[PDB]
Amino acid sequence: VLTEGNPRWEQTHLRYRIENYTPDLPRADVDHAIEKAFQLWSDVTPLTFTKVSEGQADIMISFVRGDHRDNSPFDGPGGNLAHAFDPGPGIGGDAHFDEDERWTNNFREYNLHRVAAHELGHSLGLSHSTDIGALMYPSYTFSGDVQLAQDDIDGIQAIYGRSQNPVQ
Numbered sequence: 001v002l003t004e005g006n007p008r009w010e011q012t013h014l015r016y017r018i019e020n021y022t023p024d025l026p027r028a029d030v031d032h033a034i035e036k037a038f039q040l041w042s043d044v045t046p047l048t049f050t051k052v053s054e055g056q057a058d059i060m061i062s063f064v065r066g067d068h069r070d071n072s073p074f075d076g077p078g079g080n081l082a083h084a085f086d087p088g089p090g091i092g093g094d095a096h097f098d099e100d101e102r103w104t105n106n107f108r109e110y111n112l113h114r115v116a117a118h119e120l121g122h123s124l125g126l127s128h129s130t131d132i133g134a135l136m137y138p139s140y141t142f143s144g145d146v147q148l149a150q151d152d153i154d155g156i157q158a159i160y161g162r163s164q165n166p167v168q
């Protein structure tokens with residue numbers, strides 16, 4: 001079961017920029033994990049996201065460590081892995097990834113795509129789920145696959161509406 005709060009982007013076409021990259025995995029793997037995480041939400045709602053190299057983007061992603069000037073510092077390896085801000089200007093919608101963690105793209109601890117998809121749901125306005133199988137559950141889990149559970153479909157669609165088009 002979810003628990004939704006309030007703020008939500010009053011525009012269906014957002015833009016995002018990936019400020020920097022983890023030296024842990026190739027640039028293309030980072031770009032693609034982020035892209036694929038956005039693609040999940042886009043599959044069930046009328047939202048659209050566009051990667052931007054520069055200019056004003058709505059969602060700014062960055063890998064940071066410890067105190068990164070936003071009043072909520074990271075803790076090093078383990079524990080807090082990342083965090084995103086709910087819809088709004090400035091840091092609203094932004095997502096920071098704890099650089100102290102090793103970011104992977106497989107079963108090895110801390111699959112970037114699995115954490116990014118979770119965080120980005122926050123940037124859209126999603127609260128957490130109680131359902132241990134949903135994507136918005138409060139702690140990291142990797143079934144080997146990352147697809148929205150009913151809880152996630154329901155929570156996000158309640159805010160933005162459902163898609164018209166099928167999926168794949």
Ligand SMILES: CC(C)C[C@H](N[C@H](CCNC(=O)OCc1ccccc1)C(=O)O)C(=O)N[C@@H](Cc1ccccc1)C(=O)NCCN1CCOCC1
Pocket residue numbers: 072078079080081082083084085114115118119137138139140141
């Ligand atoms: C679900 C995850 C993919 C993401 C999750 N990230 C955040 C955690 C809260 N971080 C955070 O910084 O919260 C306050 C905040 C929120 C927004 C902006 C600024 C500040 C979230 O999704 O709400 C996380 O780091 N969770 C940690 C656990 C944790 C939770 C909150 C705070 C600190 C640690 C985790 O799963 N880490 C995996 C290891 N463990 C640790 C022990 O329990 C079993 C899981």
Ligand SMILES: [Ca+2]
Pocket residue numbers: 074075076077078079080081098100101
């Ligand atoms: Ca950490």
Ligand SMILES: [Zn+2]
Pocket residue numbers: 068070072083096
């Ligand atoms: Zn931060």
Ligand SMILES: [Zn+2]
Pocket residue numbers: 118119122128136137138
């Ligand atoms: Zn969360």
